[PDB]
Write an enzyme that holds these catalytic residues in place. Sequence first.
Site, PDB file in Angstrom:
ATOM      1  N   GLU A  11      16.983  63.110  22.412  1.00 15.13           N
ATOM      2  CA  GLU A  11      16.665  64.187  21.423  1.00 15.13           C
ATOM      3  C   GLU A  11      17.734  64.769  20.891  1.00 15.13           C
ATOM      4  O   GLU A  11      17.673  65.288  19.739  1.00 15.13           O
ATOM      5  CB  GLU A  11      15.713  65.217  22.400  1.00 15.13           C
ATOM      6  CG  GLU A  11      14.537  64.795  22.669  1.00 15.13           C
ATOM      7  CD  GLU A  11      13.380  64.270  21.773  1.00 15.13           C
ATOM      8  OE1 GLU A  11      13.596  64.665  20.650  1.00 15.13           O
ATOM      9  OE2 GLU A  11      12.417  63.817  22.122  1.00 15.13           O
ATOM     10  N   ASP A  20      12.752  66.467  12.633  1.00 13.08           N
ATOM     11  CA  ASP A  20      12.623  65.424  13.622  1.00 13.08           C
ATOM     12  C   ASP A  20      12.130  63.883  12.878  1.00 13.08           C
ATOM     13  O   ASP A  20      11.893  64.034  11.488  1.00 13.08           O
ATOM     14  CB  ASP A  20      11.543  65.904  14.605  1.00 13.08           C
ATOM     15  CG  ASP A  20      10.010  65.609  14.291  1.00 13.08           C
ATOM     16  OD1 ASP A  20       9.726  65.236  13.230  1.00 13.08           O
ATOM     17  OD2 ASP A  20       9.358  65.992  15.345  1.00 13.08           O
TER      18      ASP A  20
HETATM   19  K   LIG Z   1      15.351  64.898  17.910  1.00 19.37           K
END
Ligand SMILES: [K+]
Length: 164
Positions: A11, A20
């Site tokens: 992440e 994202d």
């Molecule tokens: K991310």
Amino acid sequence: MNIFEMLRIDEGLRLKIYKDTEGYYTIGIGHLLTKSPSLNAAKSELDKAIGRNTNGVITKDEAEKLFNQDVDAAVRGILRNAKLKPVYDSLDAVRRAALINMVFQMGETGVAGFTNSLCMLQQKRWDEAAVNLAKSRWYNQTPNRAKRVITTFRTGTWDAYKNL
Ligand SMILES: [K+]
Ligand SMILES: *SC1=NC(C)(C)N(O)C1(C)C
Ligand SMILES: [Cl-]
Ligand SMILES: [Cl-]
Ligand SMILES: [Cl-]
């Protein structure tokens, strides 16, 4: 390696609101704020999550606090789901981390929809499960991450995260 280090690799860490891989406002270590296209809505979610007026920027400690809550929530979602819990219970701890990773990325309901992959995992048909897991929007949209998670399910080792 463990689930925290694994998701931190997958992440990243960013201290300002960013979008994202799906275009959704996010902060920290993959903390999804909202699917709304309104940055103001995302900032409101952030302030509510942190407990102060942030104007879109947080500290590393704050990012890690949300991350620990989000990992906990992914595990809780697995344990309360009638399709995910038996698979989770059947797995060793390394493969459990792979399942937590998927739930963190796509949510309990999304992962519970991988009915055939889940059955192959519960059967410990690791190569077959790996093939089936790749026949997915998930794999096509985030192939490098999906390959790492799939290798973890296939082998029960941390080999896909070692050089990272
Ligand atoms: K991310
Ligand atoms: S999941 C699932 N499908 C079949 C019927 C093959 N099973 O025995 C499981 C593993 C419960
Ligand atoms: Cl298949
Ligand atoms: Cl496909
Ligand atoms: Cl990817």
